[PDB]
Design a protein around this nucleic acid. Structure first.
Ligand SMILES: Nc1ncnc2c1ncn2[C@@H]1O[C@H](COP(=O)(O)OP(=O)(O)O)[C@@H](O)[C@H]1O
Ligand SMILES: Nc1ncnc2c1ncn2[C@@H]1O[C@H](COP(=O)(O)OP(=O)(O)O)[C@@H](O)[C@H]1O
Ligand SMILES: [Mg+2]
Ligand SMILES: [Mg+2]
Ligand SMILES: [Zn+2]
Lengths: 41, 689, 48, 595, 104
DNA sequence: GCATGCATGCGCATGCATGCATGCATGCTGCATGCATGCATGCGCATGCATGC
DNA sequence: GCATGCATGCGCATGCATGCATGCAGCATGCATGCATGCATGCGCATGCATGC
């Protein structure tokens, strides 16, 4: 009201909750990486 | 799991066993048919195998009626035709008899290479088995030998092509089945539900491409190891190999550079043709659509532009090729792969005598009165007009072409021109003649002009080369070209027709084109008087718009006037109104001959070449002298379309030759010249009433 | 909707003369040693 | 996973289908037909937005404003009913009043996105119908099993979904090779069309606006270029308007189009879409009743253009042309004409153009042309264009479009020879032949003609022969079945009467006439009878052997004209055969026109 | 999507449960107890590898050597039978002789 | 009853799993640039038709 | 019949969407280290108990 969609997922910097920290890791050692341009409209 | 499995009611081992049994067992109502075919293939006298589904259905019914079980091979082939080609190939490669003829210096090179490859295969197998036996470490021995040794695969040792042909309506109707593969369809009706099936299309061919080699498997060679590497290709483009991939070079550290070898490679002869809908198939207020056909193997050169045919083929998909921005999902393009061709009208050149044709022909001659019987069967819905029909039949048959030597040439084709008052059914006769002829074309005035006649320069989509597309006059080569509204044309078209009648060629000298075309065609024209109806108060040459020389350039020039007469009008009205009440002509003592038999008889007659005797020559010279002397006085009184000239004598000779050919005789007689002069005199009674 | 093309080979000619320091000759020599070597008139390695 | 709102909406739409029983029996009837006749009908029905409005206003407004949330529930409910009632999923279509949501391509803006709309316009260009791969099936030779895979894209569902770009499988899970089974795979048809603003509604002098429409499966070839069409669908956006990645460019926006679900062709004047009405039993009873009266021809004739004074015989001729004769196709391959043509030469205030415009307004399919208005390729369709795929194609002209219809020509005498030679073939052979660079075809042009012409000297002259007054080639006149001459001679009583008539105007209805003509043309095909044969033979002989000076020549075309007129009159009579009265009427009309 | 091998294996294990009729009544008894006493028992039963050996050697060897492909089908078959009998998914346990697969 | 060795808790020194951040060099990928090609048009000239004359 | 002016189709230049690659420079990320903390371990000393004289 050049806006662009975020280049990275915003669920990491946004510490939404304490369980959100748990949800951002799983299945042993592998890190969580959503990739480049993960968002859709 | 990803890529789940599904269950279908299709077992392929059962079908392979059934294929083998059929290939070794079928009997035609002599040994097995296909075994004899395979023996001929092995001896290098055949190149293509045709599999008829009628044989398969007969085999199935024979097995059923005596109790035992059998599978439905016909429907399986119909619904999934593309998979059974290789099944049949593999079955056939397991039964081919050994060649009973030795290979000599007069065989094809492909056969030599194939035989060398087979001998090499056997030598490698024997070497491997000997080496294994000598080690001291028999089904197991051959198994281990087969496991450790390379060979040349079966596809690189075949020499034949295999095609299917559909189920005819007769066999299915007699056996109580529904032959899907032979129900003709238009391009409109072929939708995506028919992909992967064997279907038949009815249409008219509009374009054909030149034959070129399409590579199936490329071959390379390695000087380092001596192996031969083969690269399959099934795409519009491919990437050549660079470095060797054989076991020896693969296991080593220094690999060799592959070099391409054209002679060992596998090629196919390829053509692509377009097919367009017939008028009767197009809906109301729509434009006809098209379709693409692929032809491979020995079936090439079987389609020429302008042919109405029924093509058989397997309907298969292809990758999308439109604009990227308009692609929504996995879109595809369609094409037809040809397996069998049939024509609606047989060409004369392909004629051949045989019991079936001979019986019909002999019946026709036995019935007697061939001349008038053939003449009266041309457009039997038109009353009267008998001598015009005789002239038209003679134009259909033609004369004799003579090579005089020193490169000189005299035509043997007869040109006829009709010119009369309005409403005399000239157009009906033009159209009927165009429909009877196997290579006939129909044109009307200004609708066809310029490059519509002759030819134009364009670029081939399939190949990257320039070509010439023939017009009306080139499409009817060795046929009849019908021209309506002959008097309303432009000067250029008139000049082109003039040259074509002159010397059967068209010369063009324009920007980007300097060539000569072939126009071995006959002309059938129609025209009208300059003031509508004919005016008997004016000179004949003042009632028409064409130059007098052009009129003189016709063998027969007919005048058809409409003089009211209370008597003949009654007969004409009765005929026409009867024809409208029913769908047939009124006469009962005469039966018309259908177009196929007429075409057969004309094809048989065209093989003759009668010759001139001495008495006939004396009669001809006397008649020519008398007629030439007479014509000058008439032309002086300004009452002749044209004075007699040597072209009249040549036309008389041609007509006599045509009558002799129609009689099926090796020599000419006096009666033929009598009839020729009789017709040439009849040409102009309308001008003496 | 085509499938994947294949590649294969077969031996015809005799290439360059084999060198001693190439992998295939090493393999053949080792195979001969395994299947032939004798000790006390016995094929120890083949038997074991 | 399941959603509660989805289930509640499914339940509500099931209640809606329960309260109204027409769609239920429609589905039952479609299934019954498909079972009995196996042609296969598609699984689809039409719903009225009005009934939805009386039933549940909230659900109505949801479908109108939020189709992506309310329509899939309705389709599922309909599919559930269809699957429960019988011994492919089903789809829906919408009709009724769309209120403010009925727009045109010019007045369709970004505030209507994601909502259900209904647009009107003209079809400008279609696309080639292509198959789309949905499910592939394969075979492993080493194991003897069959596999498959499914594919989807963004345009097959109204709601946004997370992409799953599956690859085409060539191997097995264990490494073995695979073989494609083209006969066991599945393909669906696909097309794209363009719609523009109507030429009769767009502002003059201004460039037009257009919108794309996507069609699938059973709505793939329901229109052709040049039609007037009404398309109902969802105006939708796709992709990212340059938002993803940097994409510095800002000029482009979001791609938009319509995912159509309903296509309706509309009839207009001077267009290629023919008018058809639905015939109810009341209409059939009334028509079959009126068929039994003896002055039916007189009533139907006097019904035509009642605002004009007199010209009764021309009214009769126009009715005969509207009905028409029968065309014959012999097994040999010959064709015999069945159409009727009319020409009018008259004085310059004889109401020729009024009757011509009446014929334009009343015929189910008619195209209006003027002398110099259309010429060259504009009449025979002799113009060639080409696709962006490379091929060259043809596009229909005035008479090619009017196949099986009528064509009105005004100022006929103002034409030239180049197009008269062209129209000769149309009027006799009823075909168009084209031979250009890369085209050789023949198009059907079975149409009738009605025309009006002016005398040479401004007004018709009785002191000269007709040839000096008409001045048209004899071969052309022979192709016109009827030629009429009308003159205005001053007469006190006639002038008085026409005056009171014109004053009355200034201070059977057509729809029933159209229904009557449609039924008669569709249902009745009479045959020739010996009585009419004798009558026509006698009349043709007498006309051909008389000394009277005529307005036109006499040929076999006159005999065929007699047969055609007799058959058309019998068609008017709804009788399956031609009697003596029809032949006598044809002879009387021909004699009056000639003399 | 559905798999044909999975369904065939489910059908075969259903046939196995049909030939031997102790596990059916065991499941019935567990359900009866849980209905009457409401303590809740877990939904599980024990199968004998020996009986499987007499019944179908191929299925026996599949469970012994390819549990990831043969056991989920068996659990689904047992769950289907349990859901069909009554007016959580069920699990399986193994006893009997494990042969060479008994280790430390 | 008295003296002595032994094994059992206090009082620690010290190494090592866990877990988080930080400067940097790496490897990848969008992107500006080079380019070929086939289609569309802006237009002038040579031909055939229409209109007086 | 005879001469002029206009549509019309042929022939030649030229602009422009499409669609492919290529050297390069920017940007997010894995990696070497830099370090804090809490736990266990082994290592003696003070000593309460058992044994012998
Ligand atoms: N001798 C005849 N016999 C039957 N029908 C005829 C005859 N002469 C003319 N006709 C009819 O008259 C019409 C003449 O039209 P057409 O075939 O174009 O000939 P033309 O061009 O000579 O007028 C045709 O439809 C035809 O059916
Ligand atoms: N017979 C008639 N009956 C009623 N009105 C007529 C009649 N003749 C002429 N007119 C009137 O005169 C006008 C003639 O217009 P128009 O149809 O162009 O005649 P034309 O084409 O003969 O010049 C019309 O508006 C019409 O109202
Ligand atoms: Mg004609
Ligand atoms: Mg008018
Ligand atoms: Zn090599």
């Amino acid at each position: 009201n050049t806006v662009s969609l975020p280049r990275s997922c915003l669920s990491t910097i946004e510490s939404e909750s304490s369980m959100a920290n748990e949800s951002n890791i799983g299945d042993e050692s592998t890190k969580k990486n959503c990739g480049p341009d993960p968002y859709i409209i | 799991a990803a890529l789940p499995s599904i269950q279908l009611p299709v077992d392929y081992n059962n079908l392979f066993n059934e294929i083998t049994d059929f290939l070794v067992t079928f009997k035609q109502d002599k040994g097995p048919k296909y075994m004899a075919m395979l023996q001929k293939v092995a001896n290098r006298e055949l190149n293509s195998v045709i599999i008829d589904l009628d044989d398969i259905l007969q085999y199935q019914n024979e097995k059923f009626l005596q109790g035992t079980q059998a599978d439905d091979l016909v429907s399986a082939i119909q619904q999934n035709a593309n998979h059974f080609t290789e099944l049949f190939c593999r079955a056939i490669d397991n039964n081919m008899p050994l060649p009973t003829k030795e290979i000599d210096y007069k065989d094809d090179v492909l056969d030599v290479i194939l035989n060398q490859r087979r001998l090499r295969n056997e030598r490698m197998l024997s070497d491997r088995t000997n080496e294994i036996r000598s080690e001291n470490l028999n089904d197991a021995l051959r198994e281990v030998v087969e496991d450790e040794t390379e060979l040349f695969p079966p596809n690189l040792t075949r020499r034949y092509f295999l095609y299917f042909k559909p189920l005819s309506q007769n066999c299915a109707r007699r056996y109580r089945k529904k032959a899907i593969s032979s129900k003709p369809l238009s391009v409109r009706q072929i939708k995506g539900d028919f992909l992967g099936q064997l279907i038949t299309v009815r249409g008219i061919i509009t374009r054909v491409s030149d034959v070129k080699p399409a590579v199936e498997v490329i071959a390379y060679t390695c000087d380092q190891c001596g192996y031969e590497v083969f690269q399959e290709v099934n795409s519009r483009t491919f990437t050549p190999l660079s470095e060797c991939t054989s076991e020896e070079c693969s296991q080593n550290q220094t690999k060799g550079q592959l070099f391409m070898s054209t002679r060992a490679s596998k090629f196919s002869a390829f053509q692509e043709c377009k097919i367009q809908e017939l008028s009767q198939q197009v809906p109301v207020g729509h434009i006809p659509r098209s379709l693409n056909i692929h032809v491979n193997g020995t079936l090439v050169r079987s389609l020429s532009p302008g042919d109405i045919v029924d093509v058989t083929g397997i309907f298969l998909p292809a990758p999308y090729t439109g604009f990227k921005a308009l692609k929504a999902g996995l879109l595809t393009e369609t094409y037809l792969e040809a397996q069998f061709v049939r024509q609606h009208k047989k060409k004369f050149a392909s004629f051949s005598l045989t019991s079936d044709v001979e019986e019909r022909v002999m019946e026709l001659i036995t019935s007697g009165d061939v001349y008038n019987r053939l003449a009266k069967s041309i457009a039997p819905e038109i009353y009267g007009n008998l001598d015009v029909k005789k002239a038209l039949l003679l134009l259909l048959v033609g004369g004799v072409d003579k090579r005089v030597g020193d490169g000189m040439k005299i035509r043997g084709d007869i040109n006829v021109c009709l010119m009369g008052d309005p409403g005399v059914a000239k157009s009906q006769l033009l159209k009927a003649i165009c429909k009877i002829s196997p290579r006939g074309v129909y044109t009307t005035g200004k609708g066809s002009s310029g490059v519509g006649l002759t030819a134009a320069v364009m670029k081939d989509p399939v190949t990257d080369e320039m070509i010439l597309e023939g017009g009306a006059l080139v499409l009817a080569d060795n046929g009849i070209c019908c021209i309506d509204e002959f008097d309303k044309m432009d000067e250029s078209d008139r000049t082109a027709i003039h040259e074509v009648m002159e010397q059967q060629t068209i010369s063009i000298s324009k920007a980007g084109i300097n060539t000569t075309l072939n126009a071995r065609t006959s002309i059938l024209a129609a025209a009208n008087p300059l003031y509508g109806r004919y005016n008997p108060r004016l000179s004949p040459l003042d009632n028409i718009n064409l130059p007098a020389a052009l009129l003189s350039r016709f063998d027969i020039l007919f005048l058809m006037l409409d003089i009211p007469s209370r008597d003949d009008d009654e007969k004409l009205a009765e005929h026409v109104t009867y024809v409208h009440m029913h769908n047939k002509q009124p006469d009962l003592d005469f039966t018309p001959v259908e177009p196929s038999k007429m075409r057969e008889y004309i094809a048989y007659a065209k093989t003759k070449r009668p010759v001139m005797s001495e008495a006939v020559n004396d009669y001809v010279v006397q008649a020519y002298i008398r007629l030439r002397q007479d014509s000058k006085r008439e032309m002086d009184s300004k009452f002749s379309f044209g004075q007699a000239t040597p072209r009249t004598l040549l036309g008389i000779i041609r007509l006599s030759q045509a009558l002799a050919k129609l009689r099926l005789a090796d020599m000419v007689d006096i009666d033929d010249v009598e009839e020729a002069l009789r017709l040439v005199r009849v040409s102009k009674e309308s001008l003496y009433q | 909707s085509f499938d994947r093309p294949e590649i294969y080979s077969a031996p015809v000619l005799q290439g360059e003369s084999p060198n001693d320091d190439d992998n295939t000759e090493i393999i053949k020599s080792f195979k001969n040693f395994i299947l032939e070597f004798r000790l006390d008139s016995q094929f120890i390695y083949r038997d074991q | 996973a399941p959603d509660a709102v989805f289930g509640d909406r499914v339940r509500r739409f099931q209640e809606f289908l329960d309260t109204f029983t027409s769609y239920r029996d429609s589905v039952r009837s479609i299934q019954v037909y498909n079972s009995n006749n196996a042609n296969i009908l598609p699984h689809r029905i039409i719903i009225s937005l009005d009934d939805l409005r009386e039933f549940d206003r909230s659900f109505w407004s949801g479908i109108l404003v939020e189709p992506a949330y309310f329509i899939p529930p309705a389709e599922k409910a309909l599919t559930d009913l269809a699957d429960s009632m019988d011994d492919h999923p089903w789809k829906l279509s919408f009709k009724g009043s769309f209120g403010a949501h009925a727009l045109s391509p010019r007045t369709l803006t970004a505030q209507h996105l994601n909502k259900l709309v209904s647009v009107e316009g003209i079809v400008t260009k279609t696309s080639l119908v292509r198959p789309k791969l949905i499910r592939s099936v394969h075979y492993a030779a080493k194991t003897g099993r069959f596999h498959y895979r499914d594919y989807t894209d963004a345009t097959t569902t109204l709601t946004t979904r997370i992409p799953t770009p599956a690859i085409y499988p060539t191997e097995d899970t264990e490494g073995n090779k695979l073989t494609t089974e083209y006969g066991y795979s599945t393909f669906i048809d696909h097309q794209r069309i363009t719609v523009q603003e109507m030429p009769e509604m767009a502002p003059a002098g201004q460039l037009p606006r257009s919108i794309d429409v996507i069609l699938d499966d059973d709505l793939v070839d329901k229109t052709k270029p040049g039609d007037r069409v009404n398309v109902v669908g969802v105006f939708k956006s796709l992709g990212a308007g340059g938002m993803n990645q940097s994409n510095s460019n800002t000029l482009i926006g979001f791609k938009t189009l319509i995912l159509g679900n309903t296509v309706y062709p509309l009839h207009a004047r001077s267009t290629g879409v023919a008018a058809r009405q639905m015939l109810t039993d009341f209409d059939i009873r009334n028509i079959n009743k009126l068929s039994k009266k003896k002055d039916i021809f007189d009533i139907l004739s006097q019904s035509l253009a009642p605002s004009i004074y007199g010209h009764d015989h021309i009214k009769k001729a126009i009715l005969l042309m509207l009905m028409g004769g029968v065309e014959k196709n012999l097994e040999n391959g010959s064709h015999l004409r069945g159409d009727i043509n009319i020409l009018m030469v008259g004085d310059p205030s004889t109401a020729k153009s009024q009757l011509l415009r009446f014929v334009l307004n009343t015929a189910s399919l008619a195209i209006a042309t003027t002398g110099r208005g259309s010429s060259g390729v504009g009449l025979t369709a002799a113009v060639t264009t080409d696709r962006e795929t490379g091929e060259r194609r043809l596009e229909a002209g005035a008479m090619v479009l009017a196949d099986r219809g009528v064509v009105c020509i005004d100022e006929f005498d103002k034409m030239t020879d180049v197009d008269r030679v062209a129209i000769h073939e149309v009027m006799e052979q009823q075909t168009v032949t084209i031979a250009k660079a890369g085209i050789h075809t023949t198009l059907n042009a079975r149409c009738s003609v009605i025309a009006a012409a002016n005398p040479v000297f401004g007004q018709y002259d009785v002191n000269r022969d007709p040839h000096q007054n008409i001045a048209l080639p004899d071969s052309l006149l022979s192709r016109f079945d009827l030629l009429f001459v009308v003159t205005d001679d001053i007469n006190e009583i006639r002038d008085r009467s026409i005056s009171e008539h014109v004053l009355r105007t200034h201070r059977v209805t057509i729809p029933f006439l159209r229904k009557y003509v449609q039924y008669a043309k569709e249902r009745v095909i009479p045959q020739l009878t010996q009585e009419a044969i004798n009558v026509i033979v006698k009349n043709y002989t007498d006309l051909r052997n008389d000394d009277n000076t005529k307005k036109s020549p006499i040929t076999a075309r006159t005999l065929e004209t007699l047969i055609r007129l007799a058959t058309a009159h019998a068609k008017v009579r709804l009788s399956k055969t031609v009697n003596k009265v029809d032949a006598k009427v044809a002879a009387n009309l021909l004699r009056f026109a000639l003399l």
